[PDB]
Specification:
To B.subtilis YqcC. By secondary structure, the chain is of the alpha+beta class. The longest helix is centred in the C-terminal third of the chain and has 13 residues. The chain has a two-stranded antiparallel ribbon with strand order 1-2. It is globular, with a radius of gyration of 11 Å. It is built from two helices and two strands; from the N terminus they run H-E-E-H.
Amino acid sequence: MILYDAIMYKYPNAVSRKDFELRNDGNGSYIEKWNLRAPLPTQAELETWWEELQKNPPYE
């Protein structure tokens, strides 16, 4: 899965390559640098955002 998508689901006002630095693993992109005043999300949290995002298509 991709962290970027999950982050964009919960934090629409957060800027990538700015507030948080992403790194490309190849199987996905995850969090390298964290400059946000927010606790580091847990596995369950990361999965839940993905679960909620993929089970519910955003209103594009």
